[PDB]
Amino acid sequence: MNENYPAKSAGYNQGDWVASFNFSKVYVGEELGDLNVGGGALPNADVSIGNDTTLTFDIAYFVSSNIAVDFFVGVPARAKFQGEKSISSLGRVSEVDYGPAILSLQYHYDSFERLYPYVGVGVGRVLFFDKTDGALSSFDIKDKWAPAFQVGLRYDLGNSWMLNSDVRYIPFKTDVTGTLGPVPVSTKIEVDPFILSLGASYVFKLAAALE
């Protein structure tokens, strides 16, 4: 004889697994200038109509109320690398990662289901950077991860699935972007490019532990 226990949509303790999915988007003044020399903010070389949404996935593990685990996974994109003066190094360090992996912790101060911000801090690295081709042997490192932070948003769109967003500032290399046709007058230049992602998330319970 055995007893049954048909549970329903309820809470969950440490060990929760929430599937986060959202697309990233690059925010930068391209219309102003893109790979062109000139000191004029005139209309030209307008961006081509289309979509630049980068489907990105992330794993959110709920273990603590004060702090939660977060993992980023998705295709690469224009962004910083290490952000620090090189003291000791030598090589090329290319960016040919296909399936990278980032690990960071998330912190919130809502303690409830409502439209509140979200903080995230941790480090990121590449996964299986080593390729399968006979080109250059001994070209892989044990583990190479760097520091990084990010701030997202948490909003409730429905009941089961919710809405999640991600915001991260991106540095701009020294360079000018404009169009031909110089003018006597002067205009302000406030671009400040950055990366922002938006999507939804769903909490799930793997219900699998061994201790």
Q: In the chain, what are the domain boundaries?
A: 1-211
For tokens 């960016």, what's the residue? 95
Supply the DSSP symbol for 174: S
Q: What is the largest CA-CA distance in the chain?
A: 91
Report d(CA 192, CA 59) in Å as an integer.
29
Is 29 buried (19+), middle (13-18) or exposed (0-12) by CB count in 10 A?
middle
Residues of 67-105 as b/e, b for ≥16 C-beta within 10 angstroms? ebbbbbebeeeeeeeeeeeeeeeeeeeeeeeeebbbebe
Report d(CA 78, CA 171) in Å as an integer.
10
Report d(CA 116, CA 124) in Å as an integer.
25
Residues in Cβ contact with 64 at an 8 Å cutoff, skipping those fewer than 6 apart: 14
User: Per DSSP, which regions of 63-156 are E strands?
Assistant: 68-73, 101-107, 116-125, 145-155
Q: Alpha carbon 196 to chain centroid distance? A: 8
Peptide-bond breaks in the chain following residues (C–N over 2.5 A): none
Report d(CA 152, CA 72) in Å as an integer.
13
For tokens 């929430």, what's the residue? 18
Q: Alpha carbon 203 to chain centroid distance? A: 19
Residues in Cβ contact with 173 at an 8 Å cutoff, skipping those fewer than 6 apart: none
What count of residues does the chain have?
211
Is 186 buried (19+), middle (13-18) or exposed (0-12) by CB count in 10 A?
exposed
CB 25, CB 50: distance < 8 Å = no
Six-digit token string for 89: 């190094």
Kindly list the distances between the CA atom of residue 84 and the CA atoms of 28, 88, 90, 169, in Å, as whole numbers in the listed order.
Answer: 24, 11, 15, 16
Nearest to 32 by CA among 197, 184, 167, 175: 175
CA-based Rg of the chain, rounded to a whole angstrom? 22
Q: Which method was used?
A: NMR
Helices (H) and strands (E) in the chain, counts: 0, 8
End-to-end CA distance of the chain: 26
CB 202, CB 18: distance < 8 Å = yes
Nearest to 9 by CA among 181, 134, 160, 182: 160
CB 19, CB 7: distance < 8 Å = no
Six-digit token string for 39: 């000191």
